[PDB]
Symmetry: D2
Subunit: 385 residues, 4 copies
């Protein structure tokens, strides 16, 4: 009902927006129900999605697909939306790298939401953004669906909408012929919060020392590489800063290396998470792999990253069986016994035992305070067509 009511109440300004809603909103409503969001929050979020996200999605120019993800720990499941906002001139001479859509979205969110802060967005836009002529050069040197600089996620947590943004470093790297490592840390080392917070500066210096010998010292795009910077759109002093590595090679040895920061982290917390990540890899027998190093102001110590396993081209029925098995290993019997039925109900129009593109990523995390968590990213449109 909510996704249908809102469709009857609001209609659509054009057919593209209708088509996006007809191929996403039922799934979104279902995910929200399954995660135990109340009716009022289902309406909150679907209304929000209708007004603010539909027009950002573009036509039904080369972007990553609209992704709904779930963050699962033993207590609860939190839903999140990941998108490439698309400007109305995206991919044309006037906007070759689609540099305006995501800021338009965030500007609109800043007058909607009382706790959204654009300062980190603006900071990183100044540091890794490009002018028109530089965007045109970057399109010549880039695969035709990487013609993007920023993208956006919306965490649907505690009855609020929490935006996050990701800035790609590659385009400025290609155009300026500057090493990715240098332009990443230079952009970070120029933040206001960096200049006033000793713990962040320590955490970063340790991260730099780990990354220096593993990533390129030259201007090449040779993995592993620092390809993305992530921030929360909140007070700079509260915001997690994230450095993402992209790489094509992952075996048990590189997992250990990335997870522990090459032997720096040796505590039982780290090793229990490591065992869990190694087990997951074995369970899957497994786009680049991602590694996400997270830092916060007021914290001098690096914690283990999150590792993202690409799932495109692996059968979704197998992934679902694999995840049930893995939830059993974790002692999450509740999650194991519903996952498969709940997956079928999110995507009723396809048979998951024949698809290979519905599960896209599986991110893994351990914290000592919070616990272990499972992040599953779905290509929503691929589960509705």
């Amino acid at each position: 009902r909510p996704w249908q009511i809102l469709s009857q109440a609001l209609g659509f300004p054009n057919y593209d927006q209708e088509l996006w809603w007809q191929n996403t909103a039922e799934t979104l409503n279902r995910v929200l129900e399954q995660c135990d969001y109340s009716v009022h929050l289902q309406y909150k979020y679907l209304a929000f999605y209708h007004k603010y996200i539909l027009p950002s999605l573009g036509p039904f120019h080369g972007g990553h697909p609209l992704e709904i993800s779930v963050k699962i720990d033993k207590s609860k499941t939190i839903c999140r939306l990941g998108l490439q906002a698309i400007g109305p001139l995206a991919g044309t001479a006037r906007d070759p790298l689609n540099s305006f859509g995501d800021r338009e979205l965030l500007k609109n969110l800043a007058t909607l939401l009382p706790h959204v802060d654009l300062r980190l967005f603006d900071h990183f836009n100044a540091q890794v953004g490009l002018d028109r002529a530089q965007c045109a050069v970057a399109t010549t040197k880039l695969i035709k669906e990487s013609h993007n600089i920023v993208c956006t996620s919306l965490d649907l947590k505690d009855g609020e909408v929490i935006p996050k943004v990701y800035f790609s470093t590659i385009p400025k790297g290609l155009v300026t012929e500057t090493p990715l490592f240098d332009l990443t840390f230079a952009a970070i080392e120029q933040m206001e919060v960096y200049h006033k917070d000793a713990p962040l500066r320590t955490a970063l210096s340790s991260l730099k020392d780990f990354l220096r010998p593993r990533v390129p010292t030259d201007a090449s795009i040779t993995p592993p590489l620092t390809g993305l910077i992530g921030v929360d759109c909140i007070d700079p002093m509260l915001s997690r800063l994230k450095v993402y590595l992209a790489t094509f090679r992952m075996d048990l040895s590189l997992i250990r290396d990335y997870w522990t920061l090459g032997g720096l982290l040796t505590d039982a917390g780290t090793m229990k998470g490591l065992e869990m990540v190694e087990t997951l890899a074995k369970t899957l027998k497994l786009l680049p792999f991602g590694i996400n190093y997270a830092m916060k102001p007021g914290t001098a110590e690096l914690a283990p990253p999150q590792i993202y396993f690409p799932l495109l081209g692996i059968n979704d029925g197998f992934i679902a069986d694999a995840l049930v098995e893995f939830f059993q290993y974790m002692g999450w019997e509740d999650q194991a016994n519903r996952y498969k039925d709940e997956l079928k109900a999110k995507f009723p129009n396809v048979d998951i035992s024949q698809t290979k593109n519905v599960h896209r990523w599986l991110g893994v995390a351990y914290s000592e305070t919070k616990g272990p968590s499972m992040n599953i990213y779905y290509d929503v449109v691929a589960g509705n067509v």
Copy 2:
């Protein structure tokens, strides 16, 4: 909650729209609850009001106030919205009679709602609408809040939105120096449905014979007069056509004359409704009075009109006591025992025992098939300020 959730989910494009929502939507949500609309329909209608009605309302140019009305019979209470849509150039040289806002609204409704039909709107717009130069002449000859030709109501019935429009005859009357009676019936006699439906033509001819000697034969604006034409925005063949009289004089004798069509209607149905209307007038000891004659294709017989009692300048605490008394007379004990508490809860920010502008109209009706009904029109903004 729904009115608040939608405010958090959607925000506002400008301050005027926020201010309208802050002074209407809580009351609207409360009315909808009191009338037993489910949560899902409360969201349906409030979302609708947010997207479609807020931008039509204009700044927080001379129009009638946004009105929420309730239609009460013993079974149920139906909620309705009445508004003057305001175009963005309303009252300026480019649009002196605000001739565009209501059509903009209806165009938007025609792509939203599957059963909305514009043919009657367009027909009456062709017959009583004016060009720019004629609109400017009419502004010279009109009171500065009658600078309007059409207005709109939205019946919120059976989980649907049913639009109705009202066309004022006075402006074309003033500008063309044509009698109001003539231009009203001429416009009606030119309808497609009139040309093909003998019963409507009979019903109308009886109405004409009753109205001819009571309203002006000349071009004057001397009451009683045919001041408004009302239609439903549905298939012309299903649509009720309504002719409204405005007048300043009402005593028991004119009530009898209007109610029975000067002795034409003499059945017990008509006389029971008459007794009820006479009692209501006595109970109130009572803007013009309105009389609304309703016709439908396939019906050759006129039924008694609805009579509208203006309540502006009478104390709202007295009206509420008066209505409780009157609901008792009718044997509607349920409605009598809640009316006063429910009224206070619709308008918590004012003390109704001191206001005089919250109740605006009280319309009365009797049908033999449906039953007696009570129509109460509230100035929503006056109950929130």
Copy 3:
């Protein structure tokens, strides 16, 4: 140059609008120059086209630019199908909203634009959603349209006109086209108060009754379009258009003279001219009968020759020859060069789709006139 300056000053809200401008506005600017509109009017009309027409055009009948040529002057006109943002979907299957949106915007821009006739014909020949969906089943997939619009760029103003198709209501109601055409006209406010129009129409009916279908069929000749000016109903020309596939010298005489009703020298001079043009030279032929309130007498129609599928180099040579016959030596000596310059990105000697219609007219007061309709996009791609 104006079309380039306005591009630099205004930009585009989206790529479709840019593309329409990049394939139409240079030509439009050139037509305006060739017709001797001043620089200020070139800017007036191109700025107008940018703000009001671009968004009506939809994603990138075809946008038509036409020229009305008599010996004194050449007047430029734009003919379009406005496209609503939900056109062709379940919510708007016959694109019934775009043209009214355009006209509402014009009613606040222009002091003399009147929507009463638009609204009257919309009420009479328009359809509701469910009837629009039935009509889409029974119609070719590019005739999913009810109204279109023209903008006459005359005397430094913009004069709108609208055209209502009768075919959809015909198919849905299974009513003869002749009956619904005249029924819609006979219901006008102006018809009820103007005897001369009623007479003129009764004579047109008497001529059309035995020539068009008495049944519900869509066979030619047929009353397929009603045209009105968006001005005071009492000043507005009402036009009834016939569409037909058969035209020979005998049918020309029949249509031109209303089957022998018109016999004056005015009529016969125009007849000789129209016969010659035919000799000099697949969409139907069009015949357009024009009536005005206060006029009881029918005049000869305008006849539209379809030119789609005929080579544009041949049409140009044919037109030069014909302008010579008329004693318009000036128009004959420039036509070919001016045509090349309107459409520089294409070779007009290779194309078959640039010239679309050639309408012809005679008046005794004004004179003979030539109306050339160009598919602008086909001369630019």
Copy 4:
């Protein structure tokens, strides 16, 4: 005439936009003519102003048109405070969104517009919602603004500039203005990679340290504005503006020469000119120190004389006298007539608010220049 043609072609989406056009566009057209912009550029810039500036202006600092006069030419510039649709409400208390909306639209219109410096300074001196609400308690009710914008109408292009106020972040953070100004500048990408800019800035700091507050107070002279060009950071002039209430011949010397640091004949020729202008002649005085990447040496500032509350007839006579002193006889003989013609709906001899600022500059390569800022609305109402 262009401003009238564009009005007829484009109309207005709402009355506020009409009103702004009816009180600004005639003047803007007249200024452009007087400065010898061709008809095509008059249309370029008025069409631009219609589409992009009107909706930014809000409901009907004040919209300023300025002229930069040297002996060769006069260049026209527009200075505005863009106004967001929720400006001044709880959702946007310091109007922090309008100017970025305007610049985003300019970035797709114009090929050379760059937002990196805009974004950098927005991150450094901008505030979140709760901090914007605190600043509104501590600020006069028309200083509820953080950024404003100018558009230089030079060489047939539009060159945007932005100005960030430091005062709000100052009040909210209780940080000295001097510290936050330089901290924001010292964090630029270009500062970290350009030694000459760092040197130029260090010399400016050394001059400003003992003259402006060391505490958090808002007392003069103070660093109140940072100005940047919206172009490649490496080409962009960075400007630090002082606002002060006290100016005599001694402080002029002090500001002009950087307290004796600059002693060359270029500096002293400009100094004589600025002294004369002062003799010839309540908002503060402005002093604008300009730096560029690749330049290690500070040049003399531009000094802005406030003219609000002084009679405009007297200012005009004062300017004629001063153009004579400069040997600009042409500019002296037309100034007064050209001023009357810019503002025909008002009598400029009765007004005190039309001329707002008079900025003065010397370069050795270019020459002396005169910048006159007009409150356009005050010359039209």
